[PDB]
Amino acid sequence: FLGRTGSSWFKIFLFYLIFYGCLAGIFIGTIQVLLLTLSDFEPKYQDRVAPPGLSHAPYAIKTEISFSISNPKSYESFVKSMHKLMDLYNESSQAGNSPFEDCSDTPADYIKRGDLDDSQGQKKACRFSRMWLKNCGYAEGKPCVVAKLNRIIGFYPKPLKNTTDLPEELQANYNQYVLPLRCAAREKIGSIEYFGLGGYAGFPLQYYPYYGKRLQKKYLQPLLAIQFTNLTQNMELRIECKVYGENIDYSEKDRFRGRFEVKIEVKS
Amino acid sequence: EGPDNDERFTYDYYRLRVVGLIVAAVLCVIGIIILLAGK
Amino acid sequence: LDELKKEVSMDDHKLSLDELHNKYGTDLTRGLTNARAKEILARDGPNSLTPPPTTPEWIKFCRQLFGGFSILLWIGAILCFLAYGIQAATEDEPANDNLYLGVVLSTVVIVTGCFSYYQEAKSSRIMDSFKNMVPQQALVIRDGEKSTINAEFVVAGDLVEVKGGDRIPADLRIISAHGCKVDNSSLTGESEPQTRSPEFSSENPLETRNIAFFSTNCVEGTARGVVVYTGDRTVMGRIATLASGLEVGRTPIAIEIEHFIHIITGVAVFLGVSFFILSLILGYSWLEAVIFLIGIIVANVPEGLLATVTVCLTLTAKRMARKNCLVKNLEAVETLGSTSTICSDKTGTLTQNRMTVAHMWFDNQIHEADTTENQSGAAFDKTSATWSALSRIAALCNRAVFQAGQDNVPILKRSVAGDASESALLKCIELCCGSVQGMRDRNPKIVEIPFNSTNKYQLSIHENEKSSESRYLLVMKGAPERILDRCSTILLNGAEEPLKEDMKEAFQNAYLELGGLGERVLGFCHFALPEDKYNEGYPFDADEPNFPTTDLCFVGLMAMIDPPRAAVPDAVGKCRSAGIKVIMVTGDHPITAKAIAKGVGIISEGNETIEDIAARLNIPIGQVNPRDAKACVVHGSDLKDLSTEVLDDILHYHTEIVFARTSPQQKLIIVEGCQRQGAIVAVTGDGVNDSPALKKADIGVAMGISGSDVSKQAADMILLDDNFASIVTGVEEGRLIFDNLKKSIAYTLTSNIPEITPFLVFIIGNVPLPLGTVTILCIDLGTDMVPAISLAYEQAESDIMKRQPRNPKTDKLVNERLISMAYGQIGMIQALGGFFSYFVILAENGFLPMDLIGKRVRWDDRWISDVEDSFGQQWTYEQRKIVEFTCHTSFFISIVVVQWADLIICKTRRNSIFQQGMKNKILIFGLFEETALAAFLSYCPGTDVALRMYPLKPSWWFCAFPYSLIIFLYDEMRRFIIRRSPGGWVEQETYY
Ligand SMILES: *[C@@H]1O[C@H](CO)[C@@H](O[C@@H]2O[C@H](CO)[C@@H](O)[C@H](O)[C@H]2NC(C)=O)[C@H](O)[C@H]1NC(C)=O
Ligand SMILES: CC(C)CCC[C@@H](C)[C@H]1CC[C@H]2[C@@H]3CC=C4C[C@@H](O)CC[C@]4(C)[C@H]3CC[C@]12C
Ligand SMILES: *[C@@H]1O[C@H](CO)[C@@H](O)[C@H](O)[C@H]1NC(C)=O
Ligand SMILES: [K+]
Ligand SMILES: [K+]
Ligand SMILES: [Mg+2]
Ligand SMILES: [Tl+]
Secondary structure, three states, X not given: OOOOOHHHHHHHHHHHHHHHHHHHHHHHHHHHHHHHOOOXXXXXXXXXXXXXXXXXXXXXXXXXXXXXXXXXXXXXXXHHHHHHHHHHHOHHHOOOOOOEEOOOOOOOOOOOOOOOOOOOOOXXXXXXXXXXXXXXXOOOOOOOOEEEEOOOXXXXXXXXXXXXXXXXXXXXXXXXXXXXXXXXXXXXXOOEEEEOHHHXXXXXXXXXXXXXXXXXXXXXXXXXXXXXXXXXXXXXXXXXXXXXXXXXXOOOOOOOOOEOOEEEEEOO | OOOOOHHHXXXXXXXXXXXXHHHXXXXXXXXXXXXXXXX | OOOOOOOOOOOOOOOOHHHHHHHHOOOOOOOEXXXXXXXXXXXXXXXXXXXXXXXXXXXXXXXXXXXXXXXXXXXXXHHHHHHHHHHHHOOOOOOOHHHHHHHHHHHHHHHHHHHHHHHOOOOOOHHHHXXXXXXXXXXXXXXXXXXXXXXXXXXXXXXXXXXXXXXXXXXXXXXXXEEEEEEOHHHHOOOOOEEOOOOOOOOOOOOOOOEEOOOOEEEEEEEEEEEEEOHHHOHHHHHHHHHHHOOOOOOHHHHHHHHHHHHHHHHHHHHHHHHHHHHHHOOOOHHHHHHHHHHHHHHHOOOXXXXXXXXXXXXXXXXXXXXXXXXXXXXXXXXXXXXXXXXXXXXXXXXXXXXXXXXXXXXXXXEEOOOOOOOOOOOXXXXXXXXXXXXXXXXXXXXXXXXXXXXXXXXXXXXXXXXXXXXHHHHHHHHHHOOHHHHHHHXXXXXXXXXXXXXXXXXXXXXXXXXXXXXXXXXXXXXXXXXXXXXXXXXXXXXXXXXXXXXXXHHHHHHHHHHHOOOEEEEXXXXXXXXXXXXXXXXXXXXXXXXXXXXXXXXXXXXXXXXXXXXXXXXXXXXXXXXXXXXXEOOOOHHHHHHHHXXXXXXXXXXXXXXXHXXXXXXXXXXXXXXXXXXXXXXXXXXXXXXXHHHHHHHHHOOEEEEEOOOHHHHHHHHHHHHHOOOOEEEEEOOHHHHHHHHHOOEEEEEOOOOOHHHHHHOOEEEOOOXXXXXXXXXXXHXXXXXXXXXXXXXXXXXXXXXXXXXXXXXXXXXXXXXXXXXXXXXXXXXXXXXXXXXXHOOOOOOHHHOOXXXXXXXXXXXXXXXXXXXXXXXXXXXXXXXXXXXXXXXXXXXXHHHHOOOHHHHXXXXXXXXXXXXXXXXXXHHHHHHHHHHHXXXXXXXXXXXXXXXXXXXXXXXOHHHHOOOOHHHHXXXXXXXXXXXXHHHOOOHHHHOOOOXXXXXXXXXXXXXXXXXXXXXXXXXXXXXXXXXXXXXXXXXX
């Protein structure tokens, strides 16, 4: 033929069949032992998610949400993702004492449901009403963005203490139980309005620590609705929403490390 | 610890780099020694 | 074009002096007119040689920039700029990826260009050396007056004059001469002075006395002649053009390189476009379809391989430089290993090029002297009183002297003023009797008759050094038979005795044997003149026989020859044991050529020519079956009337071939004949008459000390110490480097698979990219470099000089067996070890292997800063990318770790590491430096930006260890099978 005879062509096939078969069987074996060394409830390493990311619902083309108020299908793209998220926080999804629980309607302290063990059933998560998100189809004019803190197993988000000076200096400082979120731009051509649990501009600490998908399915993380009823129009406004805390840090590279990058433009 | 389990989300990449560079250097020296056993 | 120049020349030495003048419109006495000479100048053109048109270095460099790998790397470099252009227009990408990768790849092509350019070097100044043989000026007779003119202004027809010490300015017809002798070594390779006279003495113009040639010099006397040829039209000017004009051609090693380039280029374009369409079918945007292709290019092309080859060659050439063997062309480092036939000059190559005493006949006994340079033999006789009598004649009846200031150099190597035979005798006595000058001071010469054409003897009368005599001793030497007709007694073991027919017959026997050995034989005799008949003041007349020259005492015979170099016989046998055919090709006479052939082992004992059979059986040569003769001796005059097909039959039908009295073109023809049969041929030589053959040879080797400038220009290799044993070393080195290149190539190729497979699974699996493009270049250009080179220092696995020369048609540098092992077996194991570490990194950070399938879409989505892992955690864009790049880093390090084992297995093709050992210090160096480089690239701060290399955790380093070990075991088991059964299965499938 090309290389060899039929007899040789066969033997080279019988070899590579057994050979690659063995190699596949060995590869799988090493994957088995790897998995055997891992927990079902907690990942081996967590230093790469460490400082929590802050992500929002409006799917930004490039950290930007520009549209026209005087146009219907101009914002119907951002309403798709906005709906996708909030559709999960339905009351019909949170039914019965299992696996949900009614928690303080005001920001409270942490809740420990034991260890990362299966020695108990599904760890009961705090309910969250999308109805706590006042004012927010969504904002056809002047968007109503929804913030979110990235989930990390066993992470206890710790707010800053009012020992020294603060950006939003001491205003509504629920020091003991709220992780604040203050959006900014100089360039003050807007109108910041925050909505959340208990009416505070933060995340209620009663939703922590997260026990993971395996030990807490259907779990709901707290949301923080932000509305920009800015009196300006037809210009790119670089708005940055920042979260503050002891376990919260940022990076010049990762522009989502505990903060937002939104470029709103109501070009109408 | 409990709420004070910050060490869980931390890794000493600084020491690791110091050690890694020490090792790389020493392996580089060892190599020179064996090569220079005759030039 | 040069087929005309490969033919024997035609001449006009047969014409009379007068007749020759009519042909050139010339005067025998007055010479040409100033006007007629200038007319002929413009007519024929200058008496000069024009160098052939060369290829500029520009075109030579750029021709390498387009050879398979460079072509693919160019397509990659441009395709980078393509994707970059498409980006800069569509979505403003502030990155530098495609732009920088395009710059890097273009640089890789340029630098790789320098390496191949360095390897494909051609240092040739043939025509320049020939031009150096034309004198600046010549002496001509114009308008009846002699004047010096620019030799280029010399034309056919003018009257030229030459004298001892000057170069022949052009081909001349001798019309007048006085004691003129010439050095025709340019045409023959033999430096013994040849007389020139107006008389025609041979039909063959290269043998007649009435022609003098350009490229030769007058050694003594004076001559006048008419110019018959000028410039390019001279006999050796044509040889110049032939030699300088010959097409170089591709070396065996070069052909091998191009061959695997085709193979690897083939699989590259195959998988390249095979997966380019396979991606579009899967619905991949052309934006991405090209990015994957660039990666495929980089994965398939072994970027550092061609440069490795060059370095391995260079390092092999450095070792040979250290044995006095200079390599002018890097590729010639290997040709000697692939050589199946050596065509060797005799004089100054196989031989020392110096008349040396070989045997002596005295006391009715043949004695043998030591002919070797360094005198590696033993003594023959010292005791016999006869010896001292013969020794005295050899010293006394000798007019040769050592040049001043030689006392530093060895006797046999020092320059001597005199003819070759007298120098030989001088050096013979000086060696075994001490200072000859002393013997010539103790015995003052009073009268002598120098060797005469008519007398055929030379005699001398000396004052006997003996005090009790202080009388007159007569000594003489000459033609053995002439000396015999002048002898009455023979000095036997001390005492004289009558010359009976018995001893006279033993003389003839001794004389015939020595002459049969191709040796020049001389007779020696002396006579103690009677005291009473010769007073202490008796005057001797040299002009008229004033003393007896008959009834003298015969002392002995001495024989001499230009002997082989000490190492030559043994080197010839060694070449022949390695299955190399050795042919002699010489301008010298057949009797001498044949005798040295037997001396060095070109013709082995018992082997006969058709002429030998005929003489032994006493029958006509036509009655001899030529197939009964394995040896042959072909004279150039017969070679001339043979067609190439008939020359091919001679080459095919004889194992032991001697081509004697060959011209320079004839040497070229014999070389081409050998090549025509498909053989790789080496030429060894030292003269300008070897230049065409040396050029045409696959490899020409010139002698460094004895070699002429031309020969060393025409060669690929120079033996700087004239050590012929270096050929044996050269062939051995050549074979070793050929095997080691295979090892180094397999090693380099093996790591291609773990660079290809990640890109494929990236498409078919939709997982995060396991390894990057930059990461690949860190391997092929970084870590693999020193290890791959180090394989050039591997010792032989068996006695390579015991095997036959490779068949260049069947035995390739890269075959299917190499690809099967490198690509199908070992590289495949490396790929898995890479993937394993990849799955380990991701799974330990929260992305278990199961959830990875079909996630790249969301993984690469720059706007999704919340991807969910297996544990329910959310990752930003840059966070998961850090893990991904950490995966690139550990996959990279996995390659290094699996290359550890590969380096050790590529060490040997057959033998076990437990047999060959670990005595390669460069290889061990490679292991340490490779690992140092990898660690540095991972842990050095800032490398995460320039190369996207991230620090690895200690446990990460050990992921591929079990795969590294399986490689070592697998290959060790496999080679154990090879050795345990030379049959073929494992052998014919995987044996590189
Ligand atoms: C989650 O809540 C949303 C609230 O808008 C539900 O949307 C309803 O969709 C139905 C049918 O398309 C409409 O008739 C209603 O007007 C919507 N709102 C309400 C309050 O009922 C959505 O269907 C819910 N999703 C799930 C899975 O239950
Ligand atoms: C990533 C995976 C799926 C690709 C696997 C490719 C396999 C099938 C390839 C890789 C190397 C290949 C072999 C390389 C060498 C030879 C020897 C030659 O004389 C005949 C073909 C043969 C035997 C090839 C057959 C196919 C082969 C085994
Ligand atoms: C939000 O909606 C409420 C009614 O639910 C209305 O009273 C109020 O004006 C709205 N706020 C703004 C800022 O438009
Ligand atoms: K050559
Ligand atoms: K490679
Ligand atoms: Mg010679
Ligand atoms: Tl490569």
